[PDB]
From a paper:
The archetypal Type II AAA+ protein NSF (N-ethylmaleimide-sensitive-factor) plays an essential role in eukaryotic trafficking through its disassembly of different SNARE (Soluble N-ethylmaleimide-sensitive factor attachment protein receptor) complexes. Here, we present higher-resolution cryo-EM reconstructions of the 20S complex composed of NSF, αSNAP, the full cytoplasmic regions of synaptobrevin-2 and syntaxin-1A, and full-length SNAP-25A in the presence of ATP under non-hydrolyzing conditions.
While both FL-20S classes show clear density for the spire, its orientation varies by a discrete rotation (if viewed from the D1 end, counter-clockwise) about the hexamer axis as well as a slight translation in the hexamer plane away from the split in the D1 ring in each. Finally, and most important, density consistent with the N-terminal residues of SNAP-25A runs from the tip of the SNARE complex to the center of the D1 ring, where it assumes an extended conformation at a 61.0° angle relative to the plane of the D1 ring. This interaction is preserved in the FL-20S-2 reconstruction as well, with a slight difference in the unstructured region of SNAP-25A running between the structured region of the SNARE complex and the D1 pore entrance. Despite the variation in spire configuration between these classes, there is little difference in the interaction between SNAP-25A and the D1 pore or in the overall configuration of the D1 and D2 domains of protomers A–E. Previously, four αSNAPs were found associated with all T-20S complex classes; in the case of the FL-20S reconstruction presented here, only two are present, similar to the structure of the V7-20S complex.
Author numbering:
A (entry chain H): 50 to 83, 141 to 204
B (entry chain K), F (entry chain L): 8 to 293
C (entry chain J): 32 to 89
D (entry chain D): 1 to 147
E (entry chain I): 191 to 256
């Protein structure tokens, strides 16, 4: 999950520069077009100490992918608009042949 | 589904324009179309899973797009041509994959170069075992990823370096990587828990040292004793190291005896169990 | 025993909370995949249309 | 004897599972004739053929004791080759068998006259191939044994 | 002197059932994030090979005016 | 201006003229404007909840786009038209999904094709239940996902191949399938803890097979047998074929209840378990 959430940085890398290209490529189109129980009492507590590992990483591992959902909240609209902008710029970039 | 006649009729079309063939304008539309012709020609072999012939037929279209003035998708056509002998068993995907990175870097660029450079490294480690080359590929790739501030893959490709470079011979470049990643990992809230096993690996790497180099990093390390996860960081080492100094190889097995149960042991650490007892027996007999 | 029971019960409902997260996650993972594939063809045919453009005005 | 690839199958009924015969089809080989099943270089096992009308040509039917001796089950690739015995020093003249009831939910203490059993034994398993340690089952007065 | 053993049986098998439940929701979870994880590898092409179309194209669109 | 008017107004302009209305060109500039009218129309048919002239309008938006020069975005609109009839009541999305794969494969874009090659298998298994052809799409699509090296995509498809080999009752092929994929999971630490279950699938697929393949494929799986999911995976299986080769259905059907108490079984597993449950009874009585 760490490495896949850190891939999100290269996702950002792609989307910002594509978005950059579409603000500039916007320009060229119009420019060109127009006791074991007492051991058990310790074993159960050995695991009571382990459930610390459980609850700590549990509470921790919750928040990250929520943060990733906000990172996705970045991705979604800047992707959908860019899907629109590529197609309109492309249809313009095909109608200027003549 | 005409694979043959395309290849022959494009022979006069893979043709520069100084002739009656030239006419008025260039032949840079003809060869441009021909690239798609050879692509489709390889495509209809590929569909019949003739990948061996298909990749060589894609080498045509991928070669001819460069000829017009386009490194742009000719490198994508090399990626495509490499997918043939990558998916197909035999070689020379190695060639087109080396063609693609040099072309992307000759575009003035960095990312996709490293992206396929580790693909080459995967081939040259997993298939064509050339660790002395593929490890250098991960090294350079990680160097580019530092040049992109995706320390993500800067750390990943270096873990791929050091995990094998350690058992091979080299325990210092190893801990260099494993301290680099652990120290850059206590920074992030995403990374600090991966840093536990990273400083563990940074601690494990011994040049047959009978000293506390693992426990040395521990005396640096942020165990945070209430956090029991670092018993998989030091408590192993805490127990076995005294054994190693004080004539107790026999006691050394009883650590993995339980740690293999509370953590199923992989190849690297198990081979390291054998390797650091090669350091035992190179203190005792070897 | 009862303290430990409750302490486990914490992680129990927290597991259910992380599944309550995956109910959103799977949706996000799907819809990002829905556009990821979609953009490559719009990009390749845009490169094609621009190829038609650049040949007219050498 | 050159050896043909065969597919290990299951014994059709209980009668031939009481014969310890590598049950085959009449389409391929002949009852009485002996063969040698090969599974690997380190496993060569010898069997008696007893054809049967419900075998698929190209597959050999084996019973559970023989498979539990042969380490075989339904639908495995094996090489079956005709094997001809040497009747100079391989015809059986004296053979000890360790016997015991097969199914442990019908154990009794009744006596079974061995002279009658051994006589009916040869009357049933004549011209059959028996190796040391080979395991099978014998039917004496409608009773399952583990031989 | 047996009812506390029956609790030692019952409350702790209950506890083990809490373990079973969280471990089963976790053999869900590990596989949830597992199965999601490769979709990122599906992006892995469409994230920069997509850029390989975009920048390599607009380097031409800006040269298409010329 | 309604969606119904767009169809007939595009019908005016679709005419292939050869007159002073044409001049020298045909209607190559006009087949795009027609496609544009349908690009708006197919959009707003769904807005009126038509769902059936919707899908036909999504078809028509690309149908005329074929004749221009461009199958590609026409193909995307075929996929969209398949998203019309699919969500709608009738079929014929399945047709446009043929129309799509026959185009994207005709360039080499196997992944985009495979996005809905699987969805074709989804309709042909859920709706138009054609499980030999549905599996001919899961397995074939898995071959495409491995064409671009994505192993886990093909493991997802091949579990549809082999998962429904139980309901297709092809246990001999199911045991042929779950082996290589679990071996591909022992390598992966990302995937290992389902690998025991993967070989359990290969293990449990019995047609009353008493090969020790069932007792050996679990042995192949490198395994610390006092591990924590193995008590519910492997020794389980040994207990279950302890009773099958006992010729006893009593303990065979006691341990299945012993196990469901600790991990609730599902339709596929439980069906396979009662499939083998009939196999003991098919030999004890008769």
């Amino acid at each position: 999950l760490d490495e896949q959430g850190e891939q999100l940085d290269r996702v950002e890398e792609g989307m910002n520069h594509i978005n950059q290209d579409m603000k500039e490529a916007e320009k060229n189109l119009k420019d060109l077009g127009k006791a074991r129980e007492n051991e058990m009492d310790e074993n159960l507590e050995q695991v009571s100490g382990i459930i610390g590992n459980l609850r700590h990483m549990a509470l921790d591992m919750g928040n990250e992918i929520d943060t990733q959902n906000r990172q996705i909240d970045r991705i979604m609209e800047k992707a959908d608009s860019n899907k629109t902008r590529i197609d309109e710029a492309n249809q313009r970039a095909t109608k200027m042949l003549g | 589904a005409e694979a043959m006649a395309l290849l022959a009729e494009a022979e006069r079309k893979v043709k520069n324009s100084q002739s009656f063939f030239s006419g008025l304008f260039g032949g840079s539309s003809k060869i441009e179309e021909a690239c798609e012709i050879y692509a489709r020609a390889a495509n209809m072999f590929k569909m019949a899973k003739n990948w061996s012939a298909a990749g060589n037929a894609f080498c045509q279209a991928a070669q001819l797009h460069l000829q017009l003035q386009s490194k742009h998708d000719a490198a994508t056509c090399f990626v495509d041509a490499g997918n043939a002998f990558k998916k197909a068993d035999p070689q020379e995907a190695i060639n087109c994959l080396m063609r693609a990175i040099e072309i992307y870097t000759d575009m003035g660029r960095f990312t996709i170069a490293a992206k396929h450079h580790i693909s080459i490294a995967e081939i040259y480690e997993t298939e064509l075992v050339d660790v002395e080359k593929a490890i250098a590929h991960y090294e350079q790739s990680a160097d580019y990823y530092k040049g992109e501030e995706s320390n993500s893959s800067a750390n990943k490709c270096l873990l791929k370096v050091a995990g094998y470079a350690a058992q091979l011979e080299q325990y210092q470049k190893a801990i260099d990587i494993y301290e680099q990643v652990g120290t850059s990992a206590m920074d992030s809230p995403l990374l600090k828990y991966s840093a536990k096993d990273y400083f563990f690996k940074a601690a494990l790497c011994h040049f047959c040292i009978d000293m506390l180099n693992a426990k040395l990093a521990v005396q640096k390390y942020e165990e945070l004793f209430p956090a029991f996860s670092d018993s998989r960081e030091c408590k192993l080492m805490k127990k076995l190291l005294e054994a190693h100094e004080e004539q107790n190889v026999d006691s050394y097995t009883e650590s993995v005896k339980e740690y293999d149960s509370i953590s199923r042991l992989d190849q690297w650490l198990t081979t390291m169990l054998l390797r650091i007892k090669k350091t035992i027996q190179g203190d005792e007999e070897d | 025993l009862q303290q430990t029971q409750a302490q486990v019960d914490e992680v129990v409902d927290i597991m259910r909370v992380n599944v309550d997260k995956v109910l959103e996650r799977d949706q996000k993972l799907s819809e990002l995949d829905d556009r990821a594939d979609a953009l490559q063809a719009g990009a390749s045919q845009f490169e094609t249309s621009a190829a038609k453009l650049k040949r007219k005005y050498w | 004897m050159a050896g043909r690839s065969m597919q290990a199958a299951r014994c059709p009924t209980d009668e031939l599972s009481l014969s310890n015969c590598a049950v085959v089809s009449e389409k391929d080989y002949q009852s009485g004739q002996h063969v040698i099943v090969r599974t690997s270089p380190n496993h060569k096992y010898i069997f008696t053929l007893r054809t049967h009308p419900s075998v698929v040509p190209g597959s050999v039917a084996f019973s559970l004791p023989q498979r539990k001796w042969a380490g075989l089950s339904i639908g495995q690739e094996i090489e079956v080759a005709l094997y001809s015995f040497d009747k100079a020093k391989q015809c059986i003249g004296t053979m000890t068998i360790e016997i015991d009831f097969l199914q442990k939910k019908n154990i009794d203490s009744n006596p079974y006259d061995t002279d009658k059993m051994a006589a009916e034994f040869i009357q049933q398993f004549n011209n059959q191939a028996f190796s040391v340690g080979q395991q099978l089952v014998f039917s004496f007065n409608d009773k399952l044994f583990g031989l | 002197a047996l009812s506390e053993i029956e609790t030692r049986h019952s409350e702790i098998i209950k506890l083990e059932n809490s373990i079973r439940e969280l471990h089963d929701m976790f053999m869900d979870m590990a596989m949830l994030v597992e199965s999601q994880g490769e979709m990122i590898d599906r992006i892995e092409y469409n994230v920069e090979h997509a850029v390989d179309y975009v920048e390599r194209a607009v380097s031409d669109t800006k040269k298409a005016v010329k």
